[PDB]
Amino acid sequence: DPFMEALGLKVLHLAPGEAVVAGEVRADHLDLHGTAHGGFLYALADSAFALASNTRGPAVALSCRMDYFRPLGAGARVEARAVEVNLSRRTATYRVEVVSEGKLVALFTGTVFRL
Amino acid sequence: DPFMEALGLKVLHLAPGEAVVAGEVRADHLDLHGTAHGGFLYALADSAFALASNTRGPAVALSCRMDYFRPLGAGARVEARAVEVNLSRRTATYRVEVVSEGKLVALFTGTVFRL
Amino acid sequence: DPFMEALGLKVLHLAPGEAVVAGEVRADHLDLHGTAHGGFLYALADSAFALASNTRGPAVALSCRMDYFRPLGAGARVEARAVEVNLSRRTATYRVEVVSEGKLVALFTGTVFRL
Amino acid sequence: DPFMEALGLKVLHLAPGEAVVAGEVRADHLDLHGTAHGGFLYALADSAFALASNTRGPAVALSCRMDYFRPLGAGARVEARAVEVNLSRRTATYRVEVVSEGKLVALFTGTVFRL
Ligand SMILES: [Cl-]
Ligand SMILES: [Mg+2]
């Protein structure tokens, strides 16, 4: 995955219906506030979401939600843990918890269309 | 904005409560499908969202939704147009339309907490 | 629609990809705070959403988002105005504005899976 | 809660950061398809969401997401089980699972603004 690699993300866990992607907030991931850009944290969660969902077969995202709980400073290590919430014949939904220092710093919810 | 620059995004319009950010889907923005990664398109929309929201004063994102309508291939030019939907004293909501070739390819909805 | 009827909702306008549903905040629509229950406002928006999407053929709702901006008191007349944002072969997305006395009370965003 | 009462909903469990609300899909809860109206299921989840969040002090809902997985028929007994995902100084987020006959019917995600 080009974008994943470009962001320095690594797959730490992969299994049917699940995946964990980890990354560090680098200097090129900060925003106007000096903290982790919302797009970086989303990209992280979305990547885990893409991996987990596609273990069930080709799937494309339809709708995703991202809830942010605490701004992260440069150097933070973040992990996105994707778990399967629902698996239908044409769609599937996953929950992705974004964790840093053992606490949930963001919550991602996404649904895909199964090809 | 470091992440914005790292993704090759440019601000094309800025005004009270609004902003337009544009970018091109580069080789480092593709995903496992060979099309624009969901995180790239979100980062684009989120950047316009951040700019528009912060014209009203310091604001941080609370919850955002991204709805994807068509996968984009390498080289696509994309524009994220942010408009203010609601402005309250402690929160504000924006709609961000992602357009390519004159058509809406994604819809972003986000709410911020005003600092 | 039984639930619509039960809540006293009326279809004011219905055309390709759009619909307007109206209702009044009744005594049986209030929450403890004494204002319009979030579920009532959602039911109103969801009803317009359903009618607008049906104009394109049978479909089932997948994911919906409701953003609340202002509280409504008992007796308020309110409307849900749905418009089509995207129509694809397999899904469709609509925006629904909940309005009362000329003010935007809430914003509903929803996607359906076309059957 | 008037609206809760009107829909026949019952509070089964209420503890710090969590709540369980139960109800039955009645004749006045159906849509045209003859299945549980999306607004009824949302009202159920929203009610548990409200009760769970109130355990932390007064708060108003900002943004909520509802993901529908399975249709429910008339007479079905259903429950909304809310759990706290995040508690911050100014906001809080909850996950609410809508269950019937041991199956996950829908997933509700909501954030409140703490007063
Ligand atoms: Cl959402
Ligand atoms: Mg009644």
∠ at Cα D18 (D12, D20), nearest 5°? 25
**Overall resolution, Å:** 1.7
DSSP D82: E
CA C44 to CA C47: how far, in whole Å?
5
Q: Which residue in D2, D27, D39 is closest to C42 by CB distance? A: D39
Task: Give which of B46, B25, B23 is closest to B37, Cα–Cα.
Answer: B25
Residue C59 with chain A: CB contacts under 8 Å: none
Strand, coil or helix: A85: strand
Minimal C-alpha gap between A93 and chain C (Å): 10
Q: Which residues of C touch A (CB under 8 A)?
A: 62-63, 65, 90-91, 111, 113
Distance of CA A18 to the CA centre of its chain: 11
CA atoms within 13 A on the CB side of B37: 30
B85 token code pair: 């939907």
**Structure tokens belonging to residue A23:** 């990354």
Binding partners of B (≥3 Cβ pairs within 8 A): A, C, D
Q: Is B56 annotated as a binding residue?
A: no
Look up residue B2 and give its two tokens: 């470091």
Q: Does A39 contact B7 at a Cβ distance shorter than 8 Å?
A: yes
Measure in Å the smallest separation between the Cα of B53 and chain D Cα atoms: 16
Closest C-alpha among D22, D113, D4, D26 to residue C30: D4
Residues 6+ apart with CB under 8 A from D87: D17, D56
Going by C-beta distance under 8 Å and a sequence separation of 6 or more, which residues neighbour residue A65? A108, A109, A110, B63, B64, B65, B66, C65, D65, D109
Nearest alpha-carbon partner for B36 in B98, B112, B103, B82: B98
φ, ψ of residue A81 to 5 degrees: the values are -110, 110
DSSP secondary structure string, A43-78? HHHHHHHHHHHHTTSSEEEEEEEEEE-S---TT-EE
- Mutation choice for C interface testing from A49, A60, A62 by most C CBs within 10 A: A62
The interaxial angle of helices A38-54 and B38-54, nearest 10 deg, is 150
Q: Which residues pair with B61 in a beta bridge?
A: B112
Q: How close C62 comes to chain A (CA, Å)?
A: 8
Rounded Cα distance, A38 and A30, in Å:
9
CB pair distance less than 8 Å for C109 and B111: no
Which of D11, D66, D105, D115 best probes binding to C when mutated, by most C CB atoms within 10 angstroms? D66
Experiment used for this model: X-ray
Handedness of CA C101, C103, C105, C111 (dihedral sign): positive
Which residues in chain C are closer than 8 Å to D66, comparing Cβ atoms? 42, 63-66
Please, which residues have CB within 8 angstroms of residue C38's CB and are 6 or more apart in sequence?
A: C31, C66, C68, D46, D50, D61, D64
- Neighbouring CB atoms inside 10 A of B27's CB total 10
User: How many CB atoms sit inside 10 A of residue C102's CB?
Assistant: 5
Q: Which ligand gives the minimal distance to the CA of A66?
A: 1
Going by C-alpha positions, the residue among B33, B12, B14 that lies closest to residue B24 is B12
Pairwise CA distance, residues A21 & A10, whole Å: 6
D98 contacts D48 by C-beta, under 8 angstroms: no
In order of their start, the domains of chain A are 1-115 (3.10.129.10)
d(CA A83, CA C104): 36
Phi, psi of C17 (to 5 degrees): 70, 5
> The sheet that has B77-87: what strands, in order across it?
A10-15, A18-24, A77-87, A91-100, A103-114, A59-68, B59-68, B103-114, B91-100, B77-87, B18-24, B10-15
A101, two tokens: 């220092």
